[PDB]
């Protein structure tokens, strides 16, 4: 386990207060659209299993499927973006704190670099 045990981690918290400094996902996000598509597919499968007209029966429950999937997907995307931002922040902090472990290397141009040539014949 990598992230668990991080200092300042409040248990059983889906979104801490520091996650509110990040841009919230746009409502037109392709991931949100895919979540809504999954909800619509679940509604169609529900109609098919229960032996109802697939594309015309249960419009209210299909709408509820889509809405629930979009809601949960939005919150899941917020948490995912927060976790990735936290990972990048920790990585950059450690790189700053350990310059001898992450040193800069000399940049030699290809004119100076010697590389072997392997003919194709």
């Amino acid at each position: 386990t990598m992230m668990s045990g991080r200092p300042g981690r409040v248990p059983l918290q889906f979104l801490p207060n520091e996650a509110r400094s990040l841009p919230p996902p746009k409502l037109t996000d392709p991931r949100l659209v895919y979540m809504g598509f999954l909800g619509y597919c679940s509604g169609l499968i529900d109609n098919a299993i229960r032996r109802r007209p697939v594309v015309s029966a249960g419009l209210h429950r299909q709408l509820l499927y889509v809405t629930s999937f979009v809601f949960f997907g939005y919150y899941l995307l917020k948490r995912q973006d927060y976790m990735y931002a936290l990972r990048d922040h920790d990585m950059f902090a450690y790189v700053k704190s350990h310059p001898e472990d992450f040193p800069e290397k000399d940049k030699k141009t290809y004119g100076e670099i010697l590389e072997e040539f392997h003919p194709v014949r």
Partner: protein
Amino acid sequence: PDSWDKDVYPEPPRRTPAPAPQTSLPNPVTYLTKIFDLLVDRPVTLAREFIEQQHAKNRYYYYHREFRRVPDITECEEKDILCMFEA
């Protein structure tokens, strides 16, 4: 037409010997050349004249794209993707 550079595409001067017949018989090649000029060359020349007159009514130009010089892979640093792409 000669819309090309003679220096880039060299061609030695053309030496055509003059016709010096030694017989009284007529020349079928010459007669057929006259017939060909009367029947083919003149009509195609007239058609080309009409077409080129129509082309000169609206004359527009196109250009040869010039590409700037950029630093090459010798000057590019290692793992420098933009300079490597340009080179």
